[PDB]
Amino acid sequence: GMNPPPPETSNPNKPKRQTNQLQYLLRVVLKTLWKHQFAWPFQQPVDAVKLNLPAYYKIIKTPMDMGTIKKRLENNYYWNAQECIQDFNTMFTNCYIYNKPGDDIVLMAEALEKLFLQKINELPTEE
Ligand SMILES: Cc1sc2c(c1C)C(c1ccc(Cl)cc1)=N[C@@H](CC(=O)Nc1ccc(O)cc1)c1nnc(C)n1-2
């Protein structure tokens, strides 16, 4: 079968701006997760064809991954930090929704999410 198109990373119709919080989300949060030993499955959209997961995109109707988030941050796609935080949370949630407790991939997501939470705890005040 086929994969869906990836999430958009550009949209001139969507308002955006740079903020110090979004800068932190790139320089601290994304960078910390991206380098993690368990980042690799999350660095690009799930290829449900090569991974033989034909039900993946029946189950997961809002796909998200850090490759997409990285591009969105580098392109200044977002209006606010909450939009980006939501993309991270959607990514983790998708993994937990599709898979089962204790699966390796869930353990990987949990390791990344722990770090994500530690970093967003110190999101700076907007200025
Ligand atoms: C490139 C990607 S994306 C990505 C993965 C991979 C290999 C990995 C994944 C599984 C284990 C490890 Cl150690 C690393 C990544 N897991 C998939 C889900 C999956 O395929 N599960 C599965 C497992 C065994 C089996 O016989 C049949 C299906 C998944 N579910 N969410 C994501 C993300 N991923």
The angstrom resolution of this structure is 1.3
Task: Outline where the chain has alpha helix (H).
Answer: 20-24, 31-34, 56-59, 66-74, 81-98, 104-120
Phi, psi of 48 (to 5 degrees): -70, -15
* Domain ranges within the chain, ordered by starting residue: 19-123
Other beta carbons less than 10 A from residue 28's beta carbon: 15
DSSP conformation class of 30: I
Tokens of 41: 């499955």
Q: Which residues contact 106 (CB under 8 A, 6 or more apart)?
A: 95, 96, 99, 100
Go through 114-126 and write b for each residue having 16 or more CB atoms within 10 A of its CB, e for each that does not: eebeebbeebeee
Are the C-beta atoms of 94 and 105 separated by less than 8 Å? Answer: no
Superfamily (CATH) of domain 19-123: Bromodomain-like (1.20.920.10)
Tokens of 118: 């530690």
Q: Which of 51, 65, 92 to mutate for ligand 1's pocket (most ligand atoms within 8 Å of CB)?
A: 51
Are the C-beta atoms of 36 and 115 separated by less than 8 Å? Answer: yes
Determined by X-ray
DSSP conformation class of 123: P
